């Protein structure tokens, strides 16, 4: 059927409507002839019936921090995707506003986690001396050991207790 | 007249280089269409497969999954179900990158919390260690009651475990591993 094509393109338009990505359909001249709701959302400016380059001097605000994405003047940070297509170019837009927003919060919290991350580290180190401390502690319960043998393990135990006390103090020094 | 063919190939490319997956089912629930993105995300064959069969092989839900749905590969994608004349129109978006970030923040704020409790997590850590050394030092005399000696002996082990447990509480808390 020839009408089936109308129903086919109908299901296609259906995609662009609920598609979570901007779709700008330019023309040989360079005019926005079509824009889905996601495109109008991010740009938040008149799209259809405007000049692509003109839209760039309104909803776009380039910055140095911008790499793969481009900062919109409305605050959003989006990535552009230009592809080869005859009879107008296609431009797919993605919303990475949240992406960079989350990234701009890890750097700040990365320094705040320094002290905490140091304690977490010093805590993992304690597992080593403690492991050896429990072994030498069990040797104190071993059978048939001379008097000078009990003091040997005891002497080796205090070493672990000391090496362990210096790590906890190091940890229990970051405080208040 | 011919404003369709040219408009078809135009939209035909949109789904080709689309950054989001597009799945079109029918009433029975059989996969009929699948763009390259969807294939990359799901990996397993789609074209000519029962959607419910794919859900078992492709998807792999979890409890931690809030809005998104974890896939077999581990990536977390969000499903957007939309009405359609011919079955449903399921779109797939990848939020593995976001989630990852959302998980990091928590872990960072997690470490900060431990950094503020270091003060309170002091008395709980020195108490057992101090005892271990208090008894360990006593077990170094010329000769003393054997029963009393074995009495202190039992203390140590318990003191060390109390500490061990107190230290494992920190690491487990510090490890975070939540809000993934």
Residue numbers in the entry:
A (entry chain B): 12 to 187
B (entry chain A): 13 to 192
Publication excerpt:
FlrB is a histidine kinase that phosphorylates FlrC, which activates Class III promoters. FlrB is a histidine kinase with a conserved dimerization and histidine phosphotransfer domain (DHp; aa 125-191) and catalytic and ATP binding domain (CA; aa 234–340). FlrC is phosphorylated at D54 within its receiver domain by histidine kinase FlrB, and the FlrC central domain forms a heptamer with ATPase activity that catalyzes σ54-dependent transcription. Our results demonstrate that the PAS domain controls FlrB activity and class III flagellar gene expression, and FlrB must switch between inactive and active forms in order for V. cholerae to successfully colonize the intestine.
Interestingly, although full-length FlrB was subjected to crystallization, crystals contained only FlrB aa 12–192 in the longest fragment (chain E). Three residues of the expression tag (Ser-Asn-Ala) and the first 11 N-terminal residues were disordered, and the C-terminus, including the catalytic domain CA (aa 193–351), was missing, likely due to peptide hydrolysis during crystallization. In the crystals, the FlrB12-192 fragments form an asymmetric dimer in which the two chains adopt different conformations; this can be seen if the PAS domains in each chain are superimposed. The extended helical DHp region forms two alternative kinks in the alpha helix at residue 130 in chain A and residue 125 in chain B, causing the two DHp regions to extend in opposite directions in this superimposition. This asymmetric fold has not been observed in dimer structures of other histidine kinases (HKs). The structure of the PAS domain is in good agreement (r.m.s.d. = 0.759 Å) with a further truncated FlrB PAS domain structure (aa 8–123) that was previously reported. FlrB PAS is a member of cluster 125 of identified PAS clusters across all domains of life. Members of this cluster have substituted Fα and Gβ elements of the prototypical PAS structure with a unique short loop region. For example, L36 is in close proximity to R22 on the opposite monomer; the substitution of phenylalanine (L36F) may lead to a cation-π interaction that causes conformational changes between PAS and the N-terminus of the opposite monomer.
